């Protein structure tokens, strides 16, 4: 077989897919990446692939340089530039994307965070035929994976990055054989995974400990969930749920121990394990107690 491919991508999520193309018999003619370096640029250089870094793909020059490549297909993974209509019609197999959700669920920029935040028990990868809309293209293939209550967005990101590489490669093979079954997106099931707004990262202590814990997981490593302590913002990096009833109001301190800073939520208890005060390194519950223990009064203190 062997296809001629232009690859476009920037952050670490894209690397495994690029590496899979590099390790295959397909020919990666060029790699497009953010101007300066990205993880993608590094792997391109290590493998003798020409590196193109336009600031914009609407510019006449850059647009025609791309369409003039004579690739069979363009593969796009986490690329920051919008692809112009001509770019999309440039190659016979079009532009194919590796999207980190099970479309039509979680179209948009933050599908990993949003899936975890919602308590989805599974998510996955969709290989998508790109068009001029936002993640509305036909789905060439899907592969699902479980989300565990242990997973942060970082963990899920890494898992999906590998699944995406394998699926993309398998899909390009079926795509050149003409063995792929298109799945048009069911608009009724479509949901949008927009970027996490800062206010969304604020912990609402009235919510269930279970809901807050999902927020803490979803938002690690960005933007990190946060609450307030002694008038100052406090980022919560690691937490766990304790399914025990309290008489205390939401946000009220239950107990402070090396095992965690236990806080009453609207139901159950959230236990803080790793946290961060302004301009300070992230610290354990034990460290925090050593520094600020005199301000930790069970039944009185109050977070948020
Ligand atoms: K190759």
Coordinates of N, CA, C and O in Angstrom, one line a residue, residues 22-153:
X22 N 5.6 7.2 11.2 CA 7.0 7.1 11.0 C 7.5 5.6 11.0 O 8.3 5.2 10.2
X23 N 6.9 4.8 11.9 CA 7.3 3.4 11.9 C 6.7 2.5 10.8 O 7.1 1.4 10.6
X24 N 5.7 3.1 10.1 CA 5.0 2.3 9.1 C 5.7 2.5 7.7 O 6.8 3.0 7.7
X25 N 5.1 2.0 6.7 CA 5.6 2.2 5.3 C 5.1 3.4 4.6 O 5.6 3.7 3.5
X26 N 4.1 4.1 5.2 CA 3.6 5.3 4.6 C 4.6 6.4 4.6 O 5.6 6.4 5.4
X27 N 4.5 7.4 3.7 CA 5.6 8.4 3.6 C 5.1 9.7 4.2 O 4.2 10.3 3.6
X28 N 5.6 10.1 5.3 CA 5.3 11.4 5.9 C 6.1 12.4 5.1 O 7.3 12.6 5.4
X29 N 5.5 13.2 4.2 CA 6.1 14.1 3.3 C 6.6 15.4 4.1 O 7.6 15.9 3.9
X30 N 5.8 15.8 5.1 CA 6.1 17.0 5.9 C 5.3 16.9 7.2 O 4.2 16.3 7.3
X31 N 5.8 17.6 8.2 CA 5.1 17.8 9.4 C 4.8 19.3 9.7 O 5.7 20.1 9.6
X32 N 3.5 19.7 9.8 CA 3.2 21.0 10.2 C 3.0 21.1 11.8 O 2.4 20.2 12.4
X33 N 3.6 22.1 12.4 CA 3.6 22.3 13.8 C 3.6 23.8 14.2 O 4.0 24.6 13.3
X34 N 3.2 24.1 15.4 CA 3.3 25.5 15.9 C 4.7 26.1 15.7 O 5.7 25.4 16.0
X35 N 4.7 27.4 15.3 CA 6.0 28.1 15.3 C 6.7 28.0 16.7 O 6.1 27.8 17.7
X36 N 8.1 28.0 16.7 CA 8.8 27.9 17.9 C 8.5 29.0 18.9 O 8.4 30.1 18.5
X37 N 10.6 24.4 21.3 CA 10.0 23.7 20.2 C 9.0 22.6 20.7 O 9.0 22.1 21.8
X38 N 8.0 22.3 19.8 CA 7.0 21.3 20.2 C 7.5 19.9 20.2 O 8.5 19.6 19.6
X39 N 6.8 19.0 20.9 CA 7.2 17.6 20.9 C 7.2 17.0 19.5 O 8.1 16.2 19.1
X40 N 6.2 17.5 18.7 CA 6.1 17.0 17.3 C 7.3 17.4 16.5 O 7.8 16.6 15.6
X41 N 7.8 18.7 16.6 CA 9.0 19.1 15.9 C 10.2 18.2 16.2 O 10.9 17.8 15.3
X42 N 10.4 18.0 17.5 CA 11.4 17.1 18.0 C 11.5 15.7 17.2 O 12.5 15.3 16.7
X43 N 10.3 15.1 17.2 CA 10.3 13.7 16.6 C 10.4 13.8 15.1 O 11.0 12.9 14.5
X44 N 9.9 14.9 14.5 CA 10.1 15.1 13.0 C 11.6 15.2 12.7 O 12.1 14.6 11.8
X45 N 12.3 16.0 13.5 CA 13.8 16.2 13.2 C 14.6 15.0 13.4 O 15.5 14.7 12.7
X46 N 14.2 14.2 14.5 CA 14.9 12.9 14.7 C 14.7 11.9 13.6 O 15.4 10.9 13.6
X47 N 13.7 12.2 12.8 CA 13.4 11.2 11.7 C 13.5 11.8 10.3 O 12.9 11.2 9.3
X48 N 14.2 12.9 10.1 CA 14.5 13.5 8.8 C 13.3 14.0 8.1 O 13.3 14.0 6.8
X49 N 12.2 14.3 8.8 CA 11.0 14.8 8.1 C 11.0 16.4 8.1 O 11.3 17.0 9.1
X50 N 10.8 17.0 6.9 CA 10.8 18.4 6.7 C 9.7 19.0 7.7 O 8.6 18.5 7.8
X51 N 10.1 20.1 8.3 CA 9.2 20.8 9.3 C 8.7 22.1 8.8 O 9.5 23.0 8.3
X52 N 7.4 22.3 8.8 CA 6.8 23.5 8.3 C 6.0 24.2 9.5 O 5.2 23.5 10.1
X53 N 6.3 25.4 9.7 CA 5.7 26.1 10.9 C 5.1 27.5 10.5 O 5.6 28.5 10.8
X54 N 3.9 27.4 9.8 CA 3.2 28.6 9.4 C 2.5 29.2 10.6 O 2.2 28.5 11.6
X55 N 2.4 30.5 10.7 CA 1.6 31.2 11.7 C 0.1 31.1 11.4 O -0.7 31.3 12.2
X56 N -0.1 31.0 10.1 CA -1.5 31.0 9.5 C -1.5 30.2 8.2 O -0.6 30.3 7.4
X57 N -2.6 29.5 8.0 CA -2.8 28.8 6.8 C -3.8 29.4 5.8 O -4.2 28.8 4.8
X58 N -4.2 30.7 6.1 CA -5.0 31.4 5.2 C -4.2 32.2 4.2 O -4.6 32.6 3.1
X59 N -2.9 32.5 4.6 CA -2.0 33.2 3.7 C -1.8 32.5 2.4 O -1.5 31.3 2.4
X60 N -2.0 33.2 1.3 CA -1.9 32.7 0.0 C -0.7 31.7 -0.1 O -0.8 30.6 -0.5
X61 N 0.5 32.2 0.3 CA 1.7 31.5 0.1 C 1.7 30.1 0.8 O 1.9 29.1 0.2
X62 N 1.5 30.2 2.1 CA 1.5 28.9 2.9 C 0.4 28.0 2.5 O 0.6 26.7 2.4
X63 N -0.8 28.5 2.1 CA -1.9 27.7 1.6 C -1.5 26.9 0.4 O -1.8 25.7 0.2
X64 N -0.8 27.5 -0.6 CA -0.5 26.9 -1.9 C 0.7 26.0 -1.7 O 0.8 25.0 -2.5
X65 N 1.6 26.3 -0.8 CA 2.7 25.4 -0.5 C 2.2 24.1 0.0 O 2.7 23.0 -0.4
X66 N 1.2 24.1 0.9 CA 0.6 22.9 1.4 C -0.2 22.1 0.3 O 0.0 20.9 0.1
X67 N -1.1 22.7 -0.4 CA -1.9 22.0 -1.4 C -1.0 21.5 -2.6 O -1.4 20.6 -3.3
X68 N 0.2 22.1 -2.7 CA 1.1 21.7 -3.8 C 1.9 20.4 -3.5 O 2.8 20.0 -4.3
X69 N 1.7 19.9 -2.3 CA 2.5 18.8 -1.8 C 2.3 17.4 -2.5 O 3.2 16.6 -2.7
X70 N 1.0 17.3 -3.0 CA 0.7 16.0 -3.7 C 0.7 14.8 -2.7 O 1.3 13.8 -3.0
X71 N 0.1 15.0 -1.6 CA -0.1 13.9 -0.7 C -1.4 13.1 -1.0 O -2.2 13.7 -1.7
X72 N -1.6 11.9 -0.5 CA -2.8 11.2 -0.6 C -3.8 11.7 0.4 O -5.0 11.7 0.2
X73 N -3.2 12.1 1.6 CA -4.1 12.4 2.7 C -3.3 13.3 3.7 O -2.1 13.3 3.8
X74 N -4.0 14.1 4.5 CA -3.5 14.9 5.5 C -4.0 14.3 6.9 O -5.2 14.2 7.0
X75 N -3.1 14.0 7.8 CA -3.5 13.5 9.1 C -3.3 14.6 10.1 O -2.1 15.2 10.3
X76 N -4.3 14.9 10.9 CA -4.3 16.1 11.8 C -4.6 15.6 13.2 O -5.6 15.0 13.5
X77 N -3.6 15.9 14.2 CA -3.8 15.6 15.6 C -3.4 16.7 16.5 O -2.2 17.1 16.5
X78 N -4.4 17.3 17.2 CA -4.1 18.5 18.1 C -3.3 19.5 17.3 O -2.2 19.9 17.8
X79 N -3.8 20.1 16.2 CA -3.2 21.2 15.5 C -4.0 22.4 15.8 O -5.2 22.4 15.7
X80 N -3.3 23.6 16.0 CA -3.9 24.8 16.4 C -4.5 25.7 15.4 O -5.3 26.5 15.7
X81 N -4.1 25.4 14.1 CA -4.6 26.3 13.0 C -5.9 25.7 12.4 O -6.0 24.4 12.2
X82 N -6.8 26.5 12.0 CA -8.0 26.1 11.2 C -7.6 25.8 9.8 O -6.8 26.6 9.2
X83 N -8.0 24.7 9.2 CA -7.7 24.4 7.9 C -8.7 25.0 6.9 O -9.9 24.7 7.0
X84 N -8.2 25.8 6.0 CA -9.0 26.4 4.9 C -9.7 25.4 4.0 O -9.2 24.3 3.8
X85 N -10.8 25.8 3.4 CA -11.5 25.0 2.5 C -10.6 24.3 1.4 O -10.8 23.1 1.2
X86 N -9.7 25.1 0.8 CA -8.8 24.5 -0.2 C -7.9 23.4 0.4 O -7.7 22.4 -0.2
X87 N -7.4 23.7 1.6 CA -6.6 22.7 2.3 C -7.4 21.3 2.4 O -6.8 20.3 2.3
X88 N -8.7 21.4 2.7 CA -9.5 20.3 2.9 C -9.8 19.5 1.6 O -10.1 18.3 1.6
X89 N -9.7 20.2 0.5 CA -10.0 19.6 -0.8 C -8.7 19.3 -1.6 O -8.7 19.0 -2.8
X90 N -7.6 19.5 -0.9 CA -6.3 19.4 -1.5 C -5.9 18.0 -1.9 O -5.2 17.8 -2.9
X91 N -6.2 17.0 -1.1 CA -5.8 15.7 -1.3 C -6.9 14.7 -1.5 O -8.0 14.9 -0.9
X92 N -6.7 13.6 -2.2 CA -7.8 12.7 -2.6 C -8.5 12.1 -1.5 O -9.7 11.9 -1.5
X93 N -7.8 11.8 -0.4 CA -8.5 11.2 0.8 C -8.9 12.2 1.8 O -9.4 11.9 2.9
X94 N -8.7 13.5 1.5 CA -9.1 14.6 2.4 C -8.2 14.8 3.6 O -7.1 14.3 3.7
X95 N -8.8 15.4 4.7 CA -8.1 15.6 5.9 C -8.7 14.8 7.0 O -9.9 14.9 7.2
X96 N -7.9 14.0 7.7 CA -8.5 13.0 8.7 C -7.9 13.4 10.1 O -6.7 13.6 10.2
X97 N -8.8 13.4 11.0 CA -8.5 13.9 12.4 C -8.6 12.7 13.4 O -9.4 11.8 13.3
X98 N -7.7 12.8 14.4 CA -7.8 11.9 15.6 C -8.4 12.6 16.7 O -7.7 13.4 17.4
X99 N -9.7 12.4 17.0 CA -10.4 13.2 18.1 C -10.6 12.4 19.4 O -11.0 11.2 19.3
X100 N -10.3 13.0 20.5 CA -10.3 12.3 21.8 C -11.7 12.2 22.5 O -11.8 12.5 23.6
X101 N -12.7 11.7 21.7 CA -14.0 11.4 22.3 C -14.7 10.4 21.4 O -14.3 10.2 20.3
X102 N -15.8 9.9 21.9 CA -16.7 9.1 21.0 C -17.8 10.0 20.4 O -18.9 10.1 20.9
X103 N -17.4 10.6 19.3 CA -18.3 11.5 18.6 C -19.7 10.8 18.3 O -19.7 9.6 18.0
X104 N -20.8 11.5 18.3 CA -20.9 13.0 18.4 C -20.7 13.6 19.8 O -20.9 14.8 20.0
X105 N -20.5 12.7 20.8 CA -20.3 13.2 22.2 C -19.0 14.0 22.3 O -17.9 13.5 21.8
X106 N -19.0 15.1 23.0 CA -17.8 15.9 23.2 C -17.1 16.4 22.0 O -15.9 16.1 21.9
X107 N -17.8 17.1 21.1 CA -17.1 17.8 20.0 C -16.4 19.0 20.7 O -16.9 19.5 21.7
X108 N -15.3 19.5 20.1 CA -14.7 20.7 20.6 C -13.3 20.5 21.3 O -12.7 19.4 21.1
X109 N -12.9 21.4 22.1 CA -11.5 21.5 22.5 C -11.1 20.7 23.8 O -10.0 20.3 23.9
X110 N -12.1 20.4 24.7 CA -11.7 19.8 25.9 C -12.5 18.5 26.2 O -13.0 18.3 27.3
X111 N -12.5 17.5 25.3 CA -13.3 16.3 25.4 C -12.8 15.4 26.6 O -13.6 14.7 27.2
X112 N -11.5 15.4 26.9 CA -11.0 14.6 28.0 C -11.4 15.1 29.3 O -12.0 14.4 30.1
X113 N -11.2 16.4 29.5 CA -11.7 17.1 30.8 C -13.2 16.9 31.0 O -13.7 16.5 32.0
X114 N -13.9 17.2 29.9 CA -15.4 17.1 30.0 C -15.9 15.8 30.3 O -16.9 15.6 31.0
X115 N -15.4 14.7 29.7 CA -15.8 13.4 29.9 C -15.6 13.0 31.4 O -16.6 12.5 32.0
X116 N -14.5 13.3 31.9 CA -14.2 13.0 33.3 C -15.1 13.8 34.2 O -15.7 13.2 35.2
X117 N -15.3 15.1 33.9 CA -16.1 15.9 34.7 C -17.6 15.5 34.8 O -18.2 15.6 35.9
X118 N -18.0 14.9 33.7 CA -19.4 14.4 33.7 C -19.6 13.0 34.3 O -20.7 12.5 34.5
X119 N -18.5 12.4 34.6 CA -18.5 11.0 35.2 C -18.8 10.0 34.1 O -19.4 8.9 34.4
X120 N -18.5 10.2 32.9 CA -18.6 9.2 31.8 C -17.8 8.0 32.3 O -16.7 8.2 32.8
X121 N -18.4 6.8 32.1 CA -17.6 5.6 32.5 C -16.7 5.1 31.4 O -15.8 4.3 31.6
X122 N -17.0 5.6 30.2 CA -16.1 5.3 29.0 C -16.0 6.5 28.1 O -16.9 7.3 28.1
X123 N -14.9 6.6 27.4 CA -14.7 7.6 26.3 C -14.0 6.8 25.2 O -14.0 5.6 25.2
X124 N -13.3 7.5 24.4 CA -12.6 6.9 23.3 C -12.0 7.8 22.2 O -11.9 9.0 22.4
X125 N -11.6 7.1 21.1 CA -11.1 7.9 20.0 C -12.0 7.8 18.8 O -12.6 6.7 18.6
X126 N -12.2 8.8 18.1 CA -12.9 8.8 16.8 C -12.0 9.3 15.7 O -11.4 10.4 15.9
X127 N -11.9 8.5 14.7 CA -11.2 9.0 13.5 C -12.2 9.7 12.6 O -13.2 9.0 12.1
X128 N -12.0 10.9 12.3 CA -13.0 11.8 11.7 C -12.6 12.4 10.4 O -11.5 13.0 10.3
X129 N -13.5 12.3 9.4 CA -13.3 13.1 8.1 C -13.5 14.5 8.4 O -14.6 14.9 8.8
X130 N -12.5 15.4 8.2 CA -12.7 16.8 8.5 C -13.5 17.6 7.5 O -13.4 17.3 6.3
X131 N -14.2 18.5 8.0 CA -14.8 19.6 7.2 C -14.7 21.0 7.8 O -13.8 21.2 8.6
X132 N -15.6 21.9 7.4 CA -15.5 23.3 7.8 C -16.2 23.6 9.1 O -16.1 24.7 9.6
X133 N -17.0 22.6 9.6 CA -17.6 22.7 10.9 C -16.7 22.3 12.0 O -15.6 21.8 11.8
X134 N -17.2 22.4 13.2 CA -16.4 22.0 14.4 C -16.7 20.6 14.8 O -17.8 20.3 15.4
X135 N -15.9 19.7 14.4 CA -16.0 18.3 14.8 C -17.3 17.7 14.4 O -17.9 16.9 15.1
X136 N -17.8 18.0 13.2 CA -19.1 17.5 12.7 C -18.9 16.4 11.6 O -19.9 15.8 11.1
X137 N -17.7 16.2 11.2 CA -17.4 15.3 10.1 C -17.8 13.8 10.3 O -17.9 13.3 11.5
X138 N -17.9 13.1 9.2 CA -18.3 11.7 9.3 C -17.2 10.9 10.0 O -16.0 11.2 10.0
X139 N -17.6 9.9 10.8 CA -16.7 9.1 11.6 C -16.3 7.8 10.8 O -17.1 7.0 10.4
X140 N -15.0 7.7 10.6 CA -14.5 6.5 9.9 C -14.3 5.3 10.8 O -14.5 4.2 10.4
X141 N -14.0 5.6 12.1 CA -13.8 4.5 13.1 C -13.8 5.0 14.5 O -13.7 6.2 14.8
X142 N -14.0 4.0 15.5 CA -14.1 4.3 16.9 C -13.4 3.2 17.7 O -13.4 2.1 17.2
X143 N -12.9 3.5 18.8 CA -12.3 2.6 19.8 C -12.5 3.1 21.2 O -12.1 4.3 21.4
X144 N -13.1 2.4 22.1 CA -13.5 2.9 23.4 C -12.6 2.4 24.5 O -11.9 1.4 24.3
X145 N -12.5 3.2 25.6 CA -11.7 2.7 26.7 C -12.4 3.2 28.0 O -13.2 4.2 28.0
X146 N -12.2 2.5 29.1 CA -12.9 2.8 30.4 C -12.2 4.0 31.0 O -11.0 4.2 30.8
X147 N -13.0 4.8 31.7 CA -12.4 5.8 32.6 C -12.6 5.3 34.0 O -13.7 4.9 34.4
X148 N -11.5 5.3 34.8 CA -11.5 4.9 36.2 C -11.5 6.0 37.1 O -11.1 7.1 36.8
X149 N -12.0 5.8 38.4 CA -12.1 6.9 39.4 C -10.7 7.2 39.9 O -10.5 8.1 40.7
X150 N -9.7 6.5 39.3 CA -8.3 6.8 39.6 C -7.7 7.8 38.6 O -6.6 8.3 38.9
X151 N -8.3 7.9 37.5 CA -7.8 8.6 36.3 C -7.9 10.2 36.5 O -9.0 10.7 36.7
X152 N -6.8 10.8 36.3 CA -6.8 12.3 36.0 C -6.9 12.5 34.5 O -6.8 11.5 33.8
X153 N -7.1 13.7 34.1 CA -7.1 14.0 32.6 C -5.7 13.6 32.0 O -5.6 13.2 30.9

